[PDB]
Design a protein around this motif. Structure first.
Motif, short mmCIF file in Angstrom:
data_model
loop_
_atom_site.label_atom_id
_atom_site.label_comp_id
_atom_site.label_asym_id
_atom_site.label_seq_id
_atom_site.Cartn_x
_atom_site.Cartn_y
_atom_site.Cartn_z
N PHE A 165 0.86 -1.20 0.00
CA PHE A 165 0.00 0.00 0.00
C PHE A 165 0.88 1.23 0.00
O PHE A 165 0.73 2.11 0.83
N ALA A 166 1.74 1.31 -1.00
CA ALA A 166 2.72 2.36 -1.13
C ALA A 166 2.31 3.81 -0.98
O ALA A 166 2.97 4.58 -0.29
N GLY A 167 1.25 4.22 -1.66
CA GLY A 167 0.85 5.60 -1.60
C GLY A 167 2.01 6.43 -2.10
O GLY A 167 2.67 6.06 -3.05
N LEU A 168 2.32 7.50 -1.39
CA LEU A 168 3.41 8.37 -1.78
C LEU A 168 4.78 7.76 -1.52
O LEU A 168 5.78 8.23 -2.07
N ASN A 226 -3.98 10.63 2.95
CA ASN A 226 -3.91 9.35 3.62
C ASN A 226 -2.49 8.81 3.78
O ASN A 226 -2.24 7.64 4.09
N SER A 227 -1.55 9.74 3.74
CA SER A 227 -0.15 9.40 3.87
C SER A 227 0.21 9.23 5.34
O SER A 227 -0.68 9.03 6.18
N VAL A 228 1.50 9.34 5.66
CA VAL A 228 1.97 9.16 7.02
C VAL A 228 3.05 10.16 7.37
O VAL A 228 3.81 10.57 6.50
N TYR A 288 7.49 15.82 4.65
CA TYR A 288 8.13 15.38 3.42
C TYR A 288 9.20 16.39 3.02
O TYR A 288 9.05 17.60 3.23
N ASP A 338 -3.21 -4.48 -7.79
CA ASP A 338 -4.14 -5.12 -6.83
C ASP A 338 -3.56 -6.25 -5.97
O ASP A 338 -3.62 -7.40 -6.36
N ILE A 339 -3.12 -5.91 -4.76
CA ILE A 339 -2.51 -6.88 -3.83
C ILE A 339 -3.40 -8.09 -3.63
O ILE A 339 -2.91 -9.16 -3.29
N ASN A 364 3.91 -2.08 -3.64
CA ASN A 364 2.63 -2.42 -4.23
C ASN A 364 1.62 -1.31 -3.99
O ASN A 364 1.49 -0.82 -2.86
N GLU A 365 0.93 -0.88 -5.06
CA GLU A 365 -0.07 0.19 -5.00
C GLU A 365 -0.87 0.21 -6.29
O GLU A 365 -0.31 0.41 -7.36
N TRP A 366 -2.19 0.10 -6.18
CA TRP A 366 -3.04 0.05 -7.37
C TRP A 366 -3.56 1.33 -7.98
O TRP A 366 -3.99 1.32 -9.14
N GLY A 403 0.58 0.57 5.45
CA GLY A 403 -0.32 1.57 6.00
C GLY A 403 -1.63 1.24 5.31
O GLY A 403 -2.04 1.92 4.39
N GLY A 412 5.87 7.13 1.88
CA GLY A 412 6.33 7.55 3.18
C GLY A 412 7.14 6.48 3.86
O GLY A 412 8.23 6.73 4.35
N1 LIG Z 1 -6.15 -3.61 -3.18
C1 LIG Z 1 -5.26 -2.61 -3.11
N2 LIG Z 1 -4.10 -2.80 -3.75
C2 LIG Z 1 -3.16 -1.83 -3.80
N3 LIG Z 1 -3.20 -0.64 -3.28
C3 LIG Z 1 -4.38 -0.47 -2.62
C4 LIG Z 1 -5.42 -1.36 -2.48
N4 LIG Z 1 -6.45 -0.81 -1.71
C5 LIG Z 1 -5.98 0.36 -1.44
N5 LIG Z 1 -4.72 0.64 -1.96
C6 LIG Z 1 -3.90 1.81 -1.80
O1 LIG Z 1 -3.65 1.83 -0.43
C7 LIG Z 1 -3.17 3.10 -0.06
C8 LIG Z 1 -3.55 3.35 1.39
S1 LIG Z 1 -2.91 4.94 1.89
C9 LIG Z 1 -1.20 4.54 2.32
C10 LIG Z 1 -0.30 5.69 1.89
C11 LIG Z 1 1.20 5.46 2.12
N6 LIG Z 1 1.54 5.00 3.51
C12 LIG Z 1 1.95 6.77 1.93
O2 LIG Z 1 2.77 7.12 2.87
O3 LIG Z 1 1.39 7.72 1.25
C13 LIG Z 1 -3.83 4.01 -1.05
O4 LIG Z 1 -2.91 4.57 -1.99
C14 LIG Z 1 -4.70 3.04 -1.80
O5 LIG Z 1 -4.91 3.51 -3.12
#
Ligand SMILES: Nc1ncnc2c1ncn2[C@@H]1O[C@H](CSCC[C@H](N)C(=O)O)[C@@H](O)[C@H]1O
Length: 327
Positions: A18-21, A304-306, A285, A60-61, A39-41, A78, A23
């Motif tokens: 759930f990579a997001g940015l 929704n980052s950290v 950041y 999609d994890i 991994n991030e969709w 996260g 963080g």
């Molecule tokens: N099935 C899935 N597969 C991959 N990514 C997913 C998902 N469901 C949600 N996400 C991604 O999960 C993330 C949760 S937010 C996490 C943000 C990350 N810690 C950072 O620092 O910004 C969101 O980007 C969301 O799009």
DNA sequence: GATAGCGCTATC
DNA sequence: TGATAGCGCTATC
């Protein structure tokens, strides 16, 4: 973020679920570790990621055969929180976006990393009379891991924002890690006003509205708390203005309101929302970080980052505990 | 995909 | 309580 010269995690490998940015990347990398998988969709998050790390995450994890995941030592995640936040319809595990944890659990069951480092919102701890945390505790305990968790508020770690999150650090039972501890808090010395961009660069975000009812008078002394100054409209989410002398309220991802996602601040006589760069700064950041071109996706992203600084301290202590192997 | 008006819950 | 905050929800274009 802060500079860390004592690189505790130097030889270790981790995955950024759930990579997001990214963080979690920034946090662990500043500690010497290396990212082997991400991994991030979301199409937009993948773009920012790639723009900043040169890698494009897997999709999609949910449909990722866990066996495909590279050998790793630390698993960072996260996971989504719409389903547990105090801001939504708390459908817990019954919500289509509330079962990701179980995905973490199956990746863990197979790969067995030394450490599992997860994050979510303060209400995840209280949700459903604490039954969800319990499921997470018991599920982790059953896979041979110790479960450590605590709610830590970012304003106690150098960042001027009231982001109360729960951090769950899990260690494989083998390693008898019995000296882990969460970073000790410390006095806040930076407030919103210190992070603001020069007025010239912000102009286009000013929002003069006639329903601006000022409910409290500006403050002279800086305080480590959110001081609400005004309300706009009915004063719901997004229509409340705070003082740049306090701390930013929690930034959100799907938030609405005229001062959407960032809230509104009274900057030099004017009422305005935050620029993407100020969110980056309010999240810790580095200014070298490239924010996404679409301002709406940037705010969603930071929302929704950290808060890096926080993860840095924790990652550090995670490292320490692992490196204490006396004779 | 971008916008903004809403309406609820937890917490002391 | 009575006031505040919240990695949100969802309708409209
Ligand atoms: N099935 C899935 N597969 C991959 N990514 C997913 C998902 N469901 C949600 N996400 C991604 O999960 C993330 C949760 S937010 C996490 C943000 C990350 N810690 C950072 O620092 O910004 C969101 O980007 C969301 O799009």
């Amino acid at each position: 973020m802060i500079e860390i010269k004592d690189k505790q995690l130097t030889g270790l490998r981790f995955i950024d679920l759930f990579a997001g940015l990214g963080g979690f990347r920034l946090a662990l990398e500043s500690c010497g570790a290396e990212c082997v998988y991400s991994n991030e969709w979301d199409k937009y998050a993948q773009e920012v990621y790639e723009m900043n790390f040169g890698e494009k995450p897997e999709g999609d994890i949910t449909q990722v055969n866990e066996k495909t995941i590279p050998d790793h030592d630390i698993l960072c995640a996260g996971f989504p929180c719409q389903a547990f936040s105090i801001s939504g319809k708390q459908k817990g595990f019954e919500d289509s976006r509330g079962t990701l944890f179980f995905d973490i659990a199956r990746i863990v069951r197979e790969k067995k990393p030394k450490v599992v480092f997860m994050e979510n919102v303060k209400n995840f701890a209280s949700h459903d009379n604490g039954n969800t945390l319990e499921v997470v505790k018991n599920t982790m305990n059953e896979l041979d891991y110790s479960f450590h968790a605590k709610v830590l508020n970012a304003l106690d770690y150098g960042i001027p924002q009231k982001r109360e999150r729960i951090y769950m650090i899990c260690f494989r039972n083998d390693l008898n890690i019995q000296n882990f501890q969460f970073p000790k808090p410390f006095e806040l010395n930076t407030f919103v006003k210190d992070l603001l961009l020069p007025d010239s660069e912000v102009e286009h975000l000013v929002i003069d509205r006639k329903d601006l009812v000022m409910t409290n008078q500006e403050i002279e002394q800086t305080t480590p708390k959110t001081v609400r100054l005004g309300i706009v409209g009915k004063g719901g989410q997004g229509e409340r203005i705070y003082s740049t002398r306090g701390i930013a309220i929690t930034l959100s991802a799907y938030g609405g309101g005229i001062f959407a996602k960032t809230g509104g601040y009274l900057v030099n006589g004017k009422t305005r929302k935050l620029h993407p760069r100020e969110c980056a700064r309010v999240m810790g950041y580095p200014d070298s970080y490239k924010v996404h071109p679409s301002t709406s996706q940037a705010y969603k992203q930071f929302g929704n980052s950290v808060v890096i600084n926080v993860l840095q301290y924790i990652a550090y202590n995670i490292g320490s505990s692992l490196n204490f192997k006396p004779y």
